[PDB]
Amino acid sequence: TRTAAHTHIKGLGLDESGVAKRVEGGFVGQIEAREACGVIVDLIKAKKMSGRAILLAGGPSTGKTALALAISQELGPKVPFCPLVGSELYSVEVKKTETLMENFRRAIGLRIKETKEVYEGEVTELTPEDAENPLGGYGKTISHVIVGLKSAKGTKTLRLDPTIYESIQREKVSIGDVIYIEANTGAVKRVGRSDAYATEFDLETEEYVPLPKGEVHKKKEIVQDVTLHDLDVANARPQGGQDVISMMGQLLKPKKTEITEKLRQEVNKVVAKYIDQGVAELIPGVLFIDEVNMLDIEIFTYLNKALESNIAPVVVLASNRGMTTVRGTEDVISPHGVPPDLIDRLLIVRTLPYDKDEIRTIIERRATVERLQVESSALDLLATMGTETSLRYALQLLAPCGILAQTSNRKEIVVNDVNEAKLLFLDAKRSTKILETSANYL
Amino acid sequence: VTRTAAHTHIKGLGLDESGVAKRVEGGFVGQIEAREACGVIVDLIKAKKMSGRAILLAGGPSTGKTALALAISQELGPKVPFCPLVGSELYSVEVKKTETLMENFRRAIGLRIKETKEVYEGEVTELTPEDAKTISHVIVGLKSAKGTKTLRLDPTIYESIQREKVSIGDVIYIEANTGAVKRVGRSDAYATEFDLETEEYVPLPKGEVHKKKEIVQDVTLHDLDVANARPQGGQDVISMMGQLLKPKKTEITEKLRQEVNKVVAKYIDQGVAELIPGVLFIDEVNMLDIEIFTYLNKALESNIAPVVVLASNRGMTTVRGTEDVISPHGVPPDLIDRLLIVRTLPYDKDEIRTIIERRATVERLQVESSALDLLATMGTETSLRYALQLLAPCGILAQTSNRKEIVVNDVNEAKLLFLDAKRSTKILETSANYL
Amino acid sequence: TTFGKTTSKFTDLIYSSRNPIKYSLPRLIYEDLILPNYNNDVDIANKLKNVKFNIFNPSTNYELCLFLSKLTGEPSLNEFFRVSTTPLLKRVIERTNGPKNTDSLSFKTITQELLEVTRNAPSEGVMASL
Amino acid sequence: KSLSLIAAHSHITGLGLDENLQPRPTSEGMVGQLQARRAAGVILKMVQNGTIAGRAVLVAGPPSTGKTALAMGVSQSLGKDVPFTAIAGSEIFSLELSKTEALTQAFRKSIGIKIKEETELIEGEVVEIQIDRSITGGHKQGKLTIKTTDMETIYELGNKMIDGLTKEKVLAGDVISIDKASGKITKLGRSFARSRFVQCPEGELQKRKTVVHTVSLHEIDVINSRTQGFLALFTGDTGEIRSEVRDQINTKVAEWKEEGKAEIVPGVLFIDEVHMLDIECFSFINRALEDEFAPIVMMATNRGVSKTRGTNYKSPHGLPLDLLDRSIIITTKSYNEQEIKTILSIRAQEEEVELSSDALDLLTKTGVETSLRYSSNLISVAQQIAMKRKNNTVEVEDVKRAYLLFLDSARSVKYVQENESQYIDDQGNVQISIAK
Amino acid sequence: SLSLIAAHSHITGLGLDENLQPRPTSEGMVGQLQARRAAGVILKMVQNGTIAGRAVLVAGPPSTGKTALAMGVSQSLGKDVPFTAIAGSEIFSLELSKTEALTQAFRKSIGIKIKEETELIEGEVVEIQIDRSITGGHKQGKLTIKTTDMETIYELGNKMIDGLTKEKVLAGDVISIDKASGKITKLGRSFARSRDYDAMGADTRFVQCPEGELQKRKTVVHTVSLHEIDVINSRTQGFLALFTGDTGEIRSEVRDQINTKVAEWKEEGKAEIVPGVLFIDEVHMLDIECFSFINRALEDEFAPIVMMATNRGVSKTRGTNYKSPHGLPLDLLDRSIIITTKSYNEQEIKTILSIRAQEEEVELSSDALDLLTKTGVETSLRYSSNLISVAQQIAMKRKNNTVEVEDVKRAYLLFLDSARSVKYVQENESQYIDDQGNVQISIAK
Ligand SMILES: Nc1ncnc2c1ncn2[C@@H]1O[C@H](COP(=O)(O)OP(=O)(O)O)[C@@H](O)[C@H]1O
Ligand SMILES: Nc1ncnc2c1ncn2[C@@H]1O[C@H](COP(=O)(O)OP(=O)(O)O)[C@@H](O)[C@H]1O
Ligand SMILES: Nc1ncnc2c1ncn2[C@@H]1O[C@H](COP(=O)(O)OP(=O)(O)O)[C@@H](O)[C@H]1O
Ligand SMILES: Nc1ncnc2c1ncn2[C@@H]1O[C@H](COP(=O)(O)OP(=O)(O)O)[C@@H](O)[C@H]1O
């Protein structure tokens, strides 16, 4: 098992119609932010509103990213979640507007159900039946094709169209192969060779697949999940033909292109048409852009434009700045690095720093997840480091303590182990103190 | 007939067997210490044992840094690779600058392969394929002026023969190792089959059909890198019209480089190839950005880095790409630890006079003694390069007056006609509008 | 164009269109740089750079070929040497839809299994219309 | 050949010089500037000797003093079959080529190779053509009768000649040229036979003709590189040719000159407005001039002590001192009244405008007062005003009317400076309304 | 062999015992008795593999041994574990984004291990007989394959014959056939049939006829990084992008799909994850966007352990206008633990110079080595290290085997360090081009 700075949080931890308790889901404290995030989860599950923006703000190491992953865990794996960093939008292939629109479309999911009628099994016989009165000038005029199938606890012969004989001849279907006949379009395909013929030839280059289970004929309802960006990139890519340009672009580097608003419009109308028929279902998700202080003001203005769309998901932003200039502008002093036109469109959730007991409990649960045993006085010392230097410096100094404990052949982490961890690995403050008092061209 | 461009009187470093330098020998006058340090560096390069050695040679303008690097290149010989470069060429609009630096690094490590050229040439007399439909072999009979000779051939060479539309009586060229087939033309003896025809007629080869020759192929590592990393695909032998898609330079992955190193080491272990490390020379090193200066630190720590020679004429100058970093020679302090600096000294009057006499000798001009003294005084008064550039208009003005020896009057007219930087700046300062 | 025009039992109609701009080249450049002969090494250097020192050669770099065959799933180990030494236009003309074994690291993308369903799908299907 | 309306330097047919390189006061369309013309004649002799390489000269002076006139005089005095590349300073700032690559291509375009070859040709007038077909038409027999003004012959044709004659129709009385070794047949025209129009050729019909080729280093550089064909010489996307093919071309050219199969013809590269190059371009130009295959570079600039591009300091002529150290400088001076009036009379003769003496005196006065180019632009615009009154000679009234209608520099600055509320300033303020 | 004597090739692993206690001088590393212990803890942290995504920082003055420590970690890590060593200037690419280049460098340092079991039949083909049925739909075959020792006869399928007709094989052809997978390769032509054709051809090559048994069993282990799977599953023919670098901003959907695929393979049991180390030398010249992405990209499960080296004090971070410790912002320095290197004394410099002269096959006297030690105390260490190599050649120009004091004095005279160059520049500043471009070329005033 691999652990990386997270995966000790499992949802938010509220009860039904009530206050989130202090010890639930791996969260310690942050009660008001957890209640607000639960209200946000209920807003997303209501499946009504579009283009709602939430900015959570606070100091560093307060639990903004943990709250975002708690939102994603509470919604479930079916609801899409697109985590983003603010530096990801600057690309050297397309404009940053198109990258924002692509990550915007990646966060809306579609649930499509469909009924499949199939015919699979091992080929028993394959006989093109001739007509009673053949036409002149031709040979082997097929009137119909008799094909016998064989599966587990099932055997059925079929009368087929004359026009699937070309499909038999293209896919090279012979006796003993196991095939796959779609009902409506015909269009047979070779799954492989039957497993009973695996010892036919000493040396061969084939793929022998087990004989398929169940009946030859079955009706199965298949529910498929795609996002709207997959529909956009599938419709933009031209359907596979025989032109040199399509296969040339298949053999070359797939450079991104500025997808027009027209294609997105047609995709939205056909999706709404099949939603109105009761077949498809629209699942909006969460686009989480972290550290949004690094965005340019053009992206902020396009966010102002794109939040007014009908199909937009709920976008969550996070920042740790105070009074800072927006990038691209030399004089706009703004809270959290966000320009004031966007700030009016969003609600702000505030996160508060922790205390001695919360730091101690967080360190204890992180040591529990990391499969380590810590003695209580070592826990109190680590909480003293957490309130003295940083919570994250205490959290990253658990694995070297376990390594030094295993070096001395002990499964317990004690005081001198964390003293050696202090002596070996420095935090930022002592490193800055070393930098300030050294003049050796450092 | 013979051309001369600012050099070519420099033939070598001009050292003895003990490493000491004479005064005037090899086209170099003066600067004993820099020449001796450069000879030590030439010995280090000839040892072929170390990698990533960086030398900076520094001094004022027109002191002889480029002449010293050229003397290194002539002392090493034509076998050793030498890649001269200016620092402005590392900026390209196709790839990043670090990749261009990597290619220029790998251009300085060479290989030597010993190969044999085997050629069949003559007039086709018999062309008889036979079926084993697939042909198993074809028998071709070639004829020259010294006899005939028949050959069995594989079907691939018969396919290449059918590509070139070879019939009976054509003069063809076959290489035994590569398998290349070239059709020279129809033979001269079959030229009167028609009075007018679209076929060129060539005579019979006067030598033997079989020809054997031992050759040496000199390639570098960068040739193998670009041969193994064609993005569009392998080009054919002849493409007069261009490729349909334009192939652009790409960022070559280090996995390709380590595969090329593995294959080259495998061929070296069998005694086929010989490794010849060389010299990469970067003139005007102060025109490099700080990012290339940082990448040079890791690029000098590879196992197959060549010997790198840099030159600069700046003093305590700000490094490019920085605003509050002042460093000697425009070279950052992180990189300046890794080199050894060779100092280069300015010249005196007698050295300038000897340089002017040598340049007049190599350009096949005769000068008088008083003209030489006036040119030496002018060289000490303005610059050394001014007299060297003014030597040839003096010869032209002596030629137009139907004389062969330059005198003081031609030097005076050439000084009147062409100016230096100082007099041009004096005219520039005391002028009304834009000179 | 400068074609063959008439300055006025069948009539021959042969394509004869040319360009009025003529680029003239000496015979020496062609015969001494582009064609092989006894005094140059076009074919020798071509063989040295394309066959002997190629990294996809199975006679010298079999480990890389086996690694790439496990990576992609090509049934032949000469496929990479054939791909790397023929032009892109010749590759895209004679490309075939040969089968590959399932035990490989290259599986099918979501976009591809969306596109492969609707090759012969009719109208009024939801996946085909979308 | 070489279609042209009238150029601004169309009167300069070269440098007016004697056999002892002395400048005549008026010769070949050039007047005045005796020292500059003598220096350019010395540079012309340097180019025509061809034994030295990589020398850079600089032509500096005030604007409108005849620097481009000097460059055009050198280019016309070189004549044909010698390479002359003229570029501007802003031309090398490409989006697909680096600056050093563009400078390298411009450097190698200015040096050429003279290759002499001979081919055997057929030229004559077609008398009569017979094509014979068999019963099945598998084989074709043919006979061609062709004549010149001195002989006549009949040729028996094979299959490929018959196919090459059926393609690109050839009838009787046509004058054609046949290349036997390549199979290319060109129709020269039609002979003078009423019973296009060219004459019947004379002399022999089988002629061995010698053609002298001149090909630059950049062309062989493009062809030897396999990354693109010879069509990149016309489309213009060569795309950063690698260095190793340039060393192969250099060694091949050296052994071609050693064997005697080729000669090297160096030329002149002219860089107009050299002050608009970056310092990286100057540093590349410093080290590119010591190569063996380097032309003679001519640079022209008119700045004083100005800021070098890409830096933060000022330098004489806009060029750094290390570039100026390897240069010999030719200085041009301003003109007198008589030189200005001689220039205006020559520009009158080239524009086919007949001038009165008083009109020429008024043009000389307003050219000394304002600018030479202003009078040289006024002279051609006065002829239309003269032709509107239906007379041939340009009088004083036409020159005064053209001086009233079209303004110059100082007058336009003067009318701007007391009407600046109606123009847009550096701060973007303007008043459009008439009142208030 | 294609390796020469590099800058630090004496370092072969970290000089530690079993109890993570560094020896004073062992296997290349001299001194640094706390940084070596911390790097040993980091090496055990990597070799356990149970945690992911943690960054350490190696800070100290220049010429102290930060990249020596990284080389020691790389050499003691062992093979089949990915180790990527990049600079800060590599990621500024014209055709790739900085974030995408960072993602590629991150995913090049974590790989999976695949086990393959092969059954190879390598031998020379003698004869191929093809038999067809009455219907003609399928073709049967007879193969006679021959080794130096033994010869047997196999059978072929229809797909065997179709694959054998391509890459056309005749008698005298050396092929190999896999029983389990059916892979086909043409190794070339035997040397016994090298005298008949009389001219080679383009596509042919001569290999020796194999010996030993025909059916040989051997297992192969392959280590494939996640970046290789990303490049392969992004195009039709993706290996050319692996060898030419034209991958070009691979989409995130295939990366999530490949992550799910790798988790599925680990759970089913045909693969296991081998984590690695990413080393970013000179991290101080990275943009603030790069630092932000490094901050938020270390919280993934498939993240390696990052080692960064900095020799900067309180400098200005690139892309901003303020100054920060180590040239890095405080949010990244919160997510780090710092290993601090300290400068050497005379004895450690003496031992390092002795080791470096031992590697280069240079024999020094005691007085010459003492002089080099004194120069390494006064000037930098690398100046003495280069002085060894040039004094060696000065020694053979005198026809002497070992170097002496005179050779070190001559190499000190002929070559200059930074301080002497600064002094001779400053006392003759009129002969050099300053920041304003002024210079004096003429020697007489
Ligand atoms: N309330 C909490 N309960 C448990 N763990 C927390 C809490 N808040 C923060 N953490 C832990 O602190 C570490 C760093 O928090 P992070 O998400 O980086 O905060 P921020 O987003 O404010 O920088 C994470 O590994 C997280 O597990
Ligand atoms: N010691 C010397 N002997 C002969 N010629 C010299 C010497 N030093 C310099 N030169 C000549 O001076 C000219 C310019 O020198 P150069 O190599 O450009 O110096 P730098 O590169 O330092 O400007 C060259 O043509 C060279 O031939
Ligand atoms: N000495 C001269 N003889 C003839 N025409 C001249 C002379 N000097 C200048 N001119 C003409 O004056 C016009 C402007 O001069 P021009 O050469 O463009 O100035 P500049 O030297 O600033 O480029 C040109 O048409 C040129 O033909
Ligand atoms: N602990 C050490 N043991 C042996 N040699 C060392 C040690 N530290 C540094 N060196 C030597 O110092 C030289 C440069 O030091 P380096 O590792 O580059 O320092 P930094 O990484 O701080 O620049 C290397 O060639 C290496 O041989």
Numbering used by the authors:
A (entry chain X): 22 to 463
B (entry chain T): 21 to 152, 161 to 463
C (entry chain Q): 1029 to 1036, 1069 to 1190
D (entry chain U): 15 to 209, 220 to 460
E (entry chain Y): 16 to 460
Paper text:
Unlike other chromatin remodelers, INO80 preferentially mobilizes hexasomes, which can form during transcription. Here, we report cryogenic-electron microscopy (cryo-EM) structures of endogenously purified S. cerevisiae INO80 bound to a hexasome and a nucleosome. We group subunits of the INO80 complex into four modules: Rvb module (Rvb1/Rvb2), Arp8 module (Arp8/Arp4/Actin/Ies4 and Taf14), Ino80 module (Ino80/Ies2) and Arp5 module (Arp5/Ies6). The Ino80 protein consists of three major regions: the N-terminal domain (NTD), the HSA region (Ino80HSA) and the ATPase domain (Ino80ATPase).
While the INO80 architecture appears similar to that in the INO80-nucleosome structures, a major difference is that it is rotated ~180° on a hexasome compared to a nucleosome. On a hexasome, INO80 places its ATPase subunit, Ino80, at superhelical location (SHL)-2, across from SHL-6/−7 as previously seen on nucleosomes. When INO80 binds to a hexasome, the Arp5/Ies6 regions used in the context of a nucleosome are repurposed for different interactions. We observe that Ino80ATPase engages the hexasome predominantly near SHL −2. The placement of Ino80ATPase near SHL-2 is consistent with how the ATPase subunits of other remodelers bind the nucleosome. A site-specific gap at SHL-2 substantially inhibits INO80’s sliding of hexasomes (~2000 fold) while a gap near SHL-6 does not have a major effect. We further propose that the new contacts made by the Arp5/Ies6 module with the exposed H3-H4 surface provide an anchor allowing the Ino80 motor to efficiently pump DNA through the hexasome. These findings also explain the differential effects of the Arp5/Ies6 module on hexasome versus nucleosome sliding.
